[PDB]
Design a protein around this ligand. Structure first.
Ligand SMILES: O=C1C=CC(=O)c2c(O)cccc21
Ligand SMILES: O=C1C=CC(=O)c2c(O)cccc21
Ligand SMILES: [Cl-]
Ligand SMILES: [Cl-]
Ligand SMILES: [Cl-]
Ligand SMILES: [Cl-]
Ligand SMILES: [Cl-]
Ligand SMILES: [Cl-]
Lengths: 152, 150, 149, 152, 150, 152
């Protein structure tokens, strides 16, 4: 398993697609321990047409979704390594989300960095927690438990 | 007590594709609100969540509950006031105790049920559930702060 | 009942022109009852009209045609995804359409279509579009099913 | 009252906007009588993503909508002339549609020409009828009644 | 063939919405020139931002359409109408030069691309020509591309 | 006239809007001389749906557009400073493009940096030239001439 993955590899692992694939690159990855990835934020995103007019703010809930997708990638690769064929048959689902705090608004031009760490994992159940960061500052924090389920 | 999309557009600053509340069916100042958003396949979000298997994002269910809560908090203090609405902004500080029990799909009428857990000044704490046809599909607690726009 | 996943296996239409979310009643060569939810979160509302969301009357008719199409596919070949994936549908005629009440975000647009006449791939249906029991539209139409190529 | 109008003139009269403004140019207009206009059809339009995958066919219902908007422009300018200030607070509701027949499929690269004639009009209620044409051939026929109304 | 419609264009170019800017090919002479076009309609997403109340087809996209037309010419010159082989090739555009914009392009216009082969040496193809609207030159440009395996 | 502007400032100066506003932030600006700006590239952009499926590549022509917008922002602030009121009465027309080279493909996760210097300028006619950079490496080169015009 490698520690750097680009959009080409992310597409083979996650089932998410436009406009809900919110992870552009993975810069760090340690099986069963953690992942550091990021998503660039540009004004050229449909979401900003409505959030908000003349005041582009990346939705806090989408920041969380981004953290979870990172967590999902970590959970899957920790178990099966980089396996596109099997990834194609699994899908990660949100079971819970706790302790979410928004500290700083995210705006176009920002590099939304996801920092997730494994709090607990047994089989298909994974509990991850971490933060979203912009140039070293914590813009958000969150904890969530996900499940690796069958796609079919 | 019953507000339609037009009224909603005058209170919330959210616009397409992030205004996730279609109609308000109940509102008791400082107490509770019941509102909903219809889920249809004709939504852009379904192109990627997911291809060949449409599932309304859990995070968007939460966003929907927040918007309902913020509408509750705002109207409770200022009522249906478009003019004042433009001078205030309701952003969320925290979100806690979120649980997803059932997937929401095209055809569902996603109903939001939020009650004011507590409020002090401009800090409001709401909580409740997301319901589809009488069943709880999600639940969450949120803390919001009402501030002056700008 | 047939859900979005099932509808997708039969109708060729896709986003943003698939306007039927669920089928509630189906009786071969007789009639069909289905619906589509209307939410503000639809791209059409950006232009129809700004600050005044009104589902286009022509899309209500499209939704009725698609409902009729699903009735046609299944009456002809049953629920067969394999044969379905080779076909598309063309509108032939539209007639006697009347709009009585505007459809807006929050509405559950229900389609009620019955077979008026059919032969081969050519089907003629008629009925109404309803929101909470009240007729919001009436229409008759004839459509043709044809091979992708 | 001119006889040729361009997209900028159409935007000041019709309340329709993207993705439902289906008239690109008006080539000839006779008040309270007839109007000829057209909309270019390109693959670069969102409806094609879903109608149908791998086989782009401009929706018949949108051709009717286009004929309706051509009628609406005719109807409005016949009433108040070319007045954007009066126009900016009006909308147009479809009332009835009759005897529409589609003869030829419309596809990308086509110049969809609308020919509408006023069959009967009273106040805000206009009943127009005509055809949609591509390269001189009739691809569609339709009769419709629309109402112009003040937004409230 | 000499006249290719959208269905054919789709089988040769990998470009898809909203970046497939060639609707139909009207003339094609292997290794010499290609005449094609793209209709310009207000119902295009690009006009939402370029520019509000003043729809003007982006000049860079006129050049993109010309580049796409050059690629179809190059490709069809090597293998003709071959969808299967098309899936295994890519046309990288290396340079763009001498482009001049003389007349703005707007909704209602039939943007016609006129490109000819200026030089073909190996995997490198150099094309140049003009974009026209109703007989008049609206733009001109030269482009160099390389053929390679996808 | 400062040297750093964020999206809220770019919105008030450039007339470009979604999905054609391709500059997210300004980092360096010397009136009548040079400018350095950037646009974050994310998979979450509609343009990638068609360029190309299963292989996101930011269109070379859009990189040039991005450089033009940066130049236009330089030009306008050079002649009027940060004046939203006057900016609202203008648009920009591409006049020529020359010497463009695409050396490295741009993909999601990249920080597309625009470097432009003023080659020549008189009245509303500005001629800039420079490069587009990603992590210090030249990804593209171009020279272009634009004109600021009264939107009449
Ligand atoms: O993270 C945020 C902190 C404060 C704030 O006001 C805010 C906001 O208004 C919108 C999104 C995020 C934030
Ligand atoms: O990758 C391609 C880019 C442009 C283009 O024109 C093209 C093509 O015409 C055939 C195969 C691949 C490509
Ligand atoms: Cl937010
Ligand atoms: Cl979900
Ligand atoms: Cl209507
Ligand atoms: Cl059709
Ligand atoms: Cl331009
Ligand atoms: Cl490119």
């Amino acid at each position: 398993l490698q520690s750097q993955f680009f959009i080409e590899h992310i597409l083979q692992i996650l089932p998410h697609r436009y406009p809900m694939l919110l992870v552009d690159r993975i810069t760090e990855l340690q099986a069963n321990q953690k992942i550091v990835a990021y998503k660039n934020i540009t004004f050229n995103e449909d979401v900003f047409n409505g959030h908000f007019p003349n005041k582009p703010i990346f939705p806090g809930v989408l920041i969380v979704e981004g953290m979870a997708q990172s967590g999902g990638f970590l959970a899957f690769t920790s178990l099966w390594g980089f396996d596109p064929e099997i990834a194609k048959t699994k899908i990660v689902y949100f079971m819970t989300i706790d302790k979410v705090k928004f500290r700083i608004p995210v705006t176009p031009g920002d590099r939304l960095e996801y920092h997730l760490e494994v709090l607990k994992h047994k089989g298909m159940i994974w509990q991850v927690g971490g933060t979203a960061q912009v140039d070293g500052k914590v813009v958000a924090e969150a904890e969530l438990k996900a499940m690796i389920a069958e796609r079919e």
